[PDB]
């Protein structure tokens, strides 16, 4: 239940806020959960997603298939996983737009600020 | 913005056809001078149909299926409390199948109790037609000893041939799959192994998908490498289900809608 | 509206202000003893009755000591200039305690102050000194 007077439970305001969100807010909105192995190691449930990290697809037609994220399409609220590709009729390859809630991270890409992000959220690298 | 979108893509579609075919008129003109240049196009550029892109013993012959040794007697029955169209359908099977007896099925004699009678009376196969409503829908061929049993679904029947008393010649198409040639095996067995050549009657069983079409025709030979044929007999479409393996106890294939998802395979 | 239509359309953004929670939960600011003994879950009038102190001195329209002792606890707990002192030294050594002579004097008592003024200041002088 809503207790605060600051937050709004309006549908119209909430849908607008989401669809007209900037790239920085869309980084947080495109968060993926970690697999049970990484959750056991790092002691953290979910993180925002980036490029050079591996992933396993849980839900959809491409069920159980895995790979490494090529590009976070923040405009379309999507990731494009390499080797998870729909072959066009002309022989060309087009990547499927997956959503990061349906994905699960298997192997993170640890940078300096990424290490700091884990340490902030109560982690142990 | 539909009003913007409508004009932009209508013009683009208009632009593309001009460009597509001006390329092709130049293609036509270069092909007039050199026939060889056309040949290379046909090699690289492929039509890529579904058939092209499909996603990929002797003791049996006698033991499960009827051979050319006896006349096979086929116990044609109907599902309980059926109406005019089922017997109208039985009259079309009364001609095509070799030695049919029609049995009016009067409530009870569950299934094994039937098998006891057709052991004593010594039948080879059982065939049963069923009705949900006024249309015919399902057809079930069973072999009486051992029990290899095939279920089928009919979605087409339309009725100018009027055939003779001469016995028709068999023809089958596209049974590469082993499950396909076990159904091809059924229709090799269940239909007559007599073919009297004269009378010129042909029964087909074409299967280019998982759908099997059976038709009858009249073939006329002219010596100029061509044959003519007129439509005769019942129009028909079948679907295989089950393969119950025992009399009705076991399964081997049983169609689900979990297929159709592949768009290919074809069993 | 004309101007509001542009502000929703622009990529400047709006000066978004979330200040509705702060309009209710106001912190007390003017007394530390109260700052410790003030239940914010309670209202204004309920907090006063909990303390002991009166919230209203008039008969209110409509219907309806742990801390106060600590206020009584905090209730339990000037010299003269250099010239003034040195000037009073001159008067005392000259006359002694003759205030009539002291105020009829011209040279030392320049500002013609009364007997009561001079003697009062001498009493304060006799406290800090001899």
């Amino acid at each position: 239940a809503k207790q605060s007077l600051d937050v709004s439970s309006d549908r119209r305001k909430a849908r607008k806020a989401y669809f007209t969100a900037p790239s920085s807010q869309r980084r947080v909105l495109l968060s993926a959960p970690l697999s049970k192995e990484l959750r056991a190691q790092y002691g953290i449930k979910a993180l925002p997603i980036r490029r050079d990290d591996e992933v396993l697809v849980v839900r959809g037609s491409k069920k159980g298939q895995e790979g490494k994220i090529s590009s976070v399409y923040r405009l379309k609220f999507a990731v494009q996983v390499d080797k998870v590709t729909k072959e066009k009729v002309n022989g060309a390859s087009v990547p499927i737009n997956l959503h990061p809630s349906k994905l699960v991270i298997t192997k993170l890409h640890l940078d300096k600020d990424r290490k700091a992000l884990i340490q902030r959220k109560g982690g142990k690298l | 913005n539909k009003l913007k979108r409508q004009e932009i893509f209508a013009d683009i579609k208009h632009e593309k056809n001009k460009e597509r075919h001006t390329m092709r008129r130049k293609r036509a003109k270069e092909e007039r001078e050199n026939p060889e240049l056309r040949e290379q196009r046909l090699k690289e550029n492929v039509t890529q149909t579904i058939e092209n892109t499909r996603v990929y013993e002797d003791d049996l012959m006698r033991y499960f299926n009827s051979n050319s040794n006896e006349p096979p007697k086929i116990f044609l029955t109907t599902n309980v409390n059926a109406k005019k169209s089922a017997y109208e359908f039985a009259n079309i099977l009364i001609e095509i199948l070799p030695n049919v007896t029609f049995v009016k099925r009067k409530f009870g004699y569950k299934l094994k109790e039937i098998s006891d009678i057709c052991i004593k009376r010594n039948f080879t196969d059982i065939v049963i037609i069923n009705e949900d409503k006024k249309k015919v829908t399902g057809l079930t061929f069973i072999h009486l000893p051992e029990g290899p049993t095939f279920y089928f679904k009919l979605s087409s029947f339309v009725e100018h041939g009027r055939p003779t008393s001469h016995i028709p010649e068999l023809i089958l198409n596209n049974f590469q799959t082993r499950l396909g040639q076990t159904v091809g095996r059924l229709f090799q067995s269940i239909l007559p192994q007599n073919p009297d050549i004269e009378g010129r009657q042909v029964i087909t069983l074409h299967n280019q998908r998982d759908y099997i079409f059976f038709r009858r025709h009249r073939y006329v030979f002219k010596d100029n490498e061509r044959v003519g044929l007129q439509e005769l007999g019942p129009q028909f479409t079948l679907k295989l289900k089950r393969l119950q393996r025992g009399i009705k106890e076991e399964t081997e294939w049983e169609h689900k809608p979990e297929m159709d998802k592949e768009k290919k395979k074809f069993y | 509206s004309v101007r509001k239509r542009k502000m929703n359309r622009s990529s400047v953004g709006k000066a978004t202000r979330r200040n509705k929670d702060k309009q209710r939960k106001i912190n007390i600011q003017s007394n530390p003893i109260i700052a410790a003994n003030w239940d914010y879950s309670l209202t204004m009038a309920q907090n006063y009755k909990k303390l002991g102190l009166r919230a209203k001195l008039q008969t209110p329209a409509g219907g309806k000591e742990t801390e106060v002792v600590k206020k009584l606890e905090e209730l339990a707990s000037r010299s003269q200039s250099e010239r003034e002192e040195e000037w009073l030294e001159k008067l005392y050594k000259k006359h002694g305690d003759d205030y009539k002579k002291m105020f009829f004097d011209k040279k030392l008592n320049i500002y013609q102050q009364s007997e009561g003024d001079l003697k009062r200041r001498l009493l304060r002088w006799k406290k800090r000194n001899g």
Binding site: - | - | I26, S30, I34, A55, K56, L57, K71
Partner: protein, 108 residues
């Protein structure tokens, strides 16, 4: 045609206003100590109501000064007069009781 839709809104407005005045004027009782006054006109003279301010006379008889009275939160009126004797007695008793209740904090 005005409609008072904000009856509920403005009560919450006024309550929060009192809440702020309570937060800023922490130990003090929001309002000043007003006198007790006999109402005018034959119709209402039986009624005794809250007056505006005391008087220099009522303040002087209580045992405090006019300028000091305002700093301790006693409303003082200067145009009101002390014609009645019973009103004068009631107000003096009201102030003396108030002076026994007050606890004026030191300036250190």
């Amino acid at each position: 045609v005005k409609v008072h839709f904000d009856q509920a809104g403005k009560k919450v407005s006024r309550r929060n206003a009192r809440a702020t005045r309570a937060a800023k004027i922490a130990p003090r009782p929001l309002d000043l100590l007003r006198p007790v006054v006999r109402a005018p006109t034959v119709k209402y003279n039986r009624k005794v109501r809250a007056g505006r301010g005391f008087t220099l006379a009522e303040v002087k008889a209580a045992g405090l000064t006019a300028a000091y009275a305002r700093t301790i939160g006693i409303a003082v009126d200067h145009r009101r007069q002390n014609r009645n004797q019973e009103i004068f007695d009631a107000n003096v008793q009201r102030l003396k009781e108030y002076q026994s209740k007050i606890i004026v904090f030191p300036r250190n």
